[PDB]
Symmetry: C4
Subunit: 271 residues, 4 copies
């Protein structure tokens, strides 16, 4: 239709992208000003109305996108669904979830990631890298669970604040893995009651700092490669062979050309 | 035999793998519930029986594997031997080892690594990467030993809690390497008695944080390459030339093709 | 002109570079001696005159460069503009800027980077790598802003020293990201009032340490590649195809040569 | 000569290498036992004689090497000179150096690095990687010097324990860079007197943690490549083109073969 065509042209324009970006920045700025308790009643009401105006602009934005692209076409993108969920949750009356309150309107600033394409590409690369590290993340989970059960049984009765139950142990083991007061704060006091506690905590530190770094490097390397390959696919329109596949078959390809070259030499020498 | 053939088909099936996985998860869950001291006598007896049921299911599992594959064939795999050692140690009466107690039944959760193939491949890659870093791990050991002897002689008499003997010094040097209260907790108090102690501790920190990162990066890079190469070997059935070998001979291979190409050009120009 | 030609030859000489380097080192040494409060009035006046002599040598240096290369030619280089700004700011009477004082004459030691070419190349590579990580740096900024607004609203009234306003929260969140007393100093005291505060702080730590490492690795890898490629461009005089571009088209290039090779074989077999 | 030939064969043998290794291990073990103050007078005299026996075995070892290889040939290797310096310093009466005492006989354990070839190769790779990072190490030195001068002038009078002079400031800035109590221990107390001190310390942390990681990654990547290339050179006897040189010319080489291939196709189509 003619109506949907001119709306899509407006939506896809750089100025529309800039308008939405400016309103996200403004909404973030007013929410940051609203953290200040010393403000007057009128100053607070003024910022609250600017928050309402920002929200209504986003409702118009999303509605234009659903009309212009269609319900199936809009919800086809995970980025648009994210944008829809962020805006539509603000107008949701009494939600049945295990949450304290929906006071976190500042999560609307996270739309800068979805609206700005350079930021969208960076986050996309990271998200695409996550399934590939699932096994490493599960190994860390297994180590934490085993260690938390052991720490609860070994030290729960003598150090109940740090290890009195499974929740307490998982928390202090996270603290131990981050190396935060692990010795002066946790393990030297524990060793005053349990002298060989270093046998538990030093291998736990060695294994978890290793695994976390492995997980992080795994995500970083993959995200960087995925992003680089997606940019090339976007530039040329052709499918990009992943680098690992190029490196794995590099030897196979070179020797095959060496063979085809030597047989062409064989056909050449005798003519 | 017909009996061993249908048992191997059952063992190798995805449902059998899922049954074993569910029982490991269940056993881990009941052991985690057993860390809670507030439970009733009957609640504890109930979970203890679920632990017994889980163990008996693993005894059947392993026995089916020894019968179906043979004693030589089963113990041919390091993964099956690990599975055997984890389950068989629970039925071992009075073991002669330098251990406090075999209360750590939670180590059974480590079977999730051996049973889940994606997790098995990740750990396998890491294990295969370890011999290759042996020299770096030995260099760190040498630095720790030298430093612990020096720290004991220099500071043992004035700081006996931290350096009074070799064990105490190795422990606080591990703490110093992890950067945990190294200055406010250890070196500023030491410098009040020994003003030039920074000459010992700052180079020790520089060398050990460097070496640890070197060891960790070495393992991560190798494990990632080993895993990638093993997957390709499993997919195609052909031996995968290691990437380092492809990169080392890349120059040699390209110039050899350049030479074979130029001589084919030489045979072509004059005919 | 003959005057500008002999001045440029003098400027470009290794001895002129060594003279300037020696004066920067000397100026840095006298400023370091001037930090000592126990010095006599005459000792202080003596060093202050050596600081004046060093500054006057730099005024001559820069003036020779503007005359020899021309106003347009000198200010064409970002390195020369930096050198000009560092020296010319010392002779600036009453500047209108949001600064306490221009006592930081020690920033003149930063000229060692611009004057020594090996150091200039290293910093240049790093600077050229910065625009490419802009999106990651902006993602970290967004996470810090969102988290600081949340932390101010959640914990400002009960923990005003750490979260009483946006500035206070950004500061303690930076401290939390660096893992400095995050648990014993900040989150365990906060959890005594807000028991589920770990839900906020543990994901904040996981996301920001990850993003910072991503930003740092991104800069390091790019700077290393940019430097390596610029050296090759300087050595040969030919434009260096970036490594990513060589790796992305490696597969495309190899199969194209395989195809050209097979058709040459096809023309050869039938003659 | 016949005497030097049979001595070199003995020196180069695996058993001779194993004898020397065993004596280094033994010497290290006795020095570690000598750190214990509770030992008897006779127990101490016994270990001291085993230290003397170990030293005399090393004097024989080195003397056999100088005779068998020649003064010029032995001192041609940096590894042999290191071995000579470590052993010969023990027999040096009254040395004129800025040292407290030559009690550090435990540095003899560092010979495990020189005697064991796998360990020698690892350290060699690291040492060869150091000149290449000289510029990054100098940039960190410049940042530390500038920051130490600034910190001394800004905070020396109000925080003299941490910044009272240049030495004190360099020490606490090293502590700040390692993130050790940087905020709770140093910067929050400083900000109580100087509210904008975060403007100095947060950029200092960002720049130095970045530079240190850059220096460390630079050494790790280079050492790994140098080692891999030296092994290949040792295996084949042929000079190994560095990987960076192979990667820089990969594009140049591939297009040159594409060109030589297309002209061979041109000579083929028309015959
Ligand atoms: C092609 C990108 C890619 C991987 C990749 C990216 C960059 C790179 O340098 C190398 C590979 C990839 C492939 C396999 C992989 O395996 C890890 C094990 N998983 C299955 C638990 C991880 C990433 C991938 C990611 C998710 C699903 C499928 C493929
Ligand atoms: C040696 C090149 C390499 C990989 C590689 C090895 C052989 C091969 O034929 C192709 C590539 C590499 C790159 C990515 C990779 O991703 C898997 C990530 N996991 C942790 C999810 C694995 C190996 C690599 C490893 C670690 C960091 C950076 C690069
Ligand atoms: C082929 C895999 C491999 C190595 C490798 C893997 C990935 C990669 O990118 C490069 C190499 C390997 C080879 C040599 C090596 O030497 C270190 C020194 N050791 C002997 C102390 C380490 C790993 C290896 C591992 C153990 C034994 C033999 C070979
Ligand atoms: C530059 C590519 C490279 C290596 C390489 C260099 C030259 C060559 O011809 C082939 C590969 C590299 C990769 C692995 C490696 O493993 C040894 C691990 N040690 C620490 C056990 C060494 C170099 C590399 C080095 C560090 C991290 C990631 C990659
Ligand atoms: C050619 C160097 C380069 C990049 C590069 C360097 C080394 C390397 O191994 C790979 C690439 C480069 C290219 C793209 C890039 O994208 C990140 C996203 N930005 C746009 C936010 C970053 C660096 C680059 C840097 C700035 C502008 C343009 C190009
Ligand atoms: C796997 C090789 C690789 C990159 C690569 C992947 C595919 C390809 O065709 C070419 C190169 C790589 C290198 C640099 C890079 O820079 C982007 C930096 N961002 C974070 C600004 C991206 C990928 C890489 C990734 C992480 C660390 C080191 C190397
Ligand atoms: C060939 C090894 C090498 C370098 C290298 C090693 C591995 C790798 O992946 C890439 C290069 C090398 C080359 C240049 C370099 O420049 C840094 C700047 N210096 C001059 C301050 C560093 C290392 C080198 C080291 C010292 C002197 C000369 C060359
Ligand atoms: C992208 C491949 C690469 C380098 C590279 C880029 C282009 C090229 O043609 C060849 C190689 C790389 C490798 C080593 C290197 O060493 C310099 C070390 N400095 C810090 C002393 C520089 C770039 C690299 C960069 C960082 C980590 C691992 C690998
Ligand atoms: C990795 C996931 C980690 C999840 C950790 C368990 C959930 C949080 C548990 C918790 O907050 N408790 C309150 C204790 O004060 C214990 C509960 O079991 C009851 O409420
Ligand atoms: C991948 C690792 C993931 C670690 C996840 C940790 C979650 C456990 C934290 C939690 O749910 N708590 C109950 C919340 O009610 C525990 C904390 O409250 C407790 O540990 C202490 O902070 C003190 O309150 C008691 O000393
Ligand atoms: C890197 C391996 C580190 C091993 C460290 C030595 C073993 C543990 C020593 C220890 O616990 N002692 C008890 C001291 O309280 C000292 C013993 O020698 C006696 O029992
Ligand atoms: C690669 C690095 C590996 C470091 C290994 C450290 C092991 C040494 C620990 C040990 O065996 N102890 C004896 C156990 O009885 C020492 C601890 O007990 C002691 O250091 C303190 O914690 C206090 O108890 C005394 O102040
Ligand atoms: C990432 C950029 C972080 C910038 C942080 C805000 C600027 C510094 C704010 C500050 O120092 N204040 C003084 C409070 O003592 C608050 C002001 O708003 C008034 O002066
Ligand atoms: C990318 C992350 C960037 C973080 C940037 C932090 C800047 C905020 C610091 C600031 O401007 N302050 C006001 C300066 O007047 C705050 C500090 O003063 C305050 O947080 C405390 O240090 C105490 O003074 C109060 O308890
Ligand atoms: C990066 C190299 C760092 C070198 C640091 C200076 C040398 C040590 C200075 C020192 O120990 N002093 C004693 C102060 O107690 C100050 C001296 O100047 C006098 O002895
Ligand atoms: C690349 C970074 C290199 C940092 C190098 C630091 C060397 C400076 C240490 C030094 O020489 N001191 C004098 C030694 O006499 C200083 C210490 O003594 C002093 O800072 C404190 O520890 C206290 O003694 C006073 O509060
Ligand atoms: Na740390
Ligand atoms: Na810390
Ligand atoms: Na820390």
């Amino acid at each position: 239709s003619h109506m949907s065509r001119k709306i899509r042209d407006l939506i896809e324009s750089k100025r529309f992208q800039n308008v939405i970006t400016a309103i996200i920045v403004l909404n973030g700025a007013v929410l940051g000003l609203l953290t200040d308790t010393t403000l007057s009643a009128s100053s607070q009401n003024l910022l609250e109305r600017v928050d309402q105006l920002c929200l209504t602009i986003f409702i118009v934005e999303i509605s234009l996108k659903i009309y212009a692209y269609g319900v199936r076409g809009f919800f086809r993108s995970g980025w648009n669904l994210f944008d829809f969920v962020i805006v539509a949750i603000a107008l949701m009356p009494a939600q049945g979830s295990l949450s304290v309150l929906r006071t976190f309107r500042i999560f609307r600033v996270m739309r800068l990631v979805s609206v700005i394409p350079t930021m969208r590409r960076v986050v996309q690369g990271m998200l695409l890298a996550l399934p590939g590290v699932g096994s490493v993340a599960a190994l860390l989970t297994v180590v934490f669970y085993i260690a938390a059960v052991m720490a609860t049984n070994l030290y729960g009765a003598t150090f109940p604040e740090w290890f009195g139950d499974l929740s307490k142990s998982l928390y202090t083991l996270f603290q131990v893995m981050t190396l935060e007061s692990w010795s002066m704060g946790i393990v030297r006091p524990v060793m005053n009651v349990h002298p060989n506690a270093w046998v538990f905590f030093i291998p736990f530190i060695m294994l978890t700092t290793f695994t976390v770094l492995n997980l992080f490097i795994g995500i970083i390397v993959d995200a960087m490669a995925i992003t680089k390959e997606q940019e090339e696919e976007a530039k040329t329109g052709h499918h990009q062979e992943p680098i690992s596949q190029t490196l794995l078959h590099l030897g196979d390809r070179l020797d095959r050309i060496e063979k085809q070259l030597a047989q062409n030499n064989e056909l050449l020498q005798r003519q």
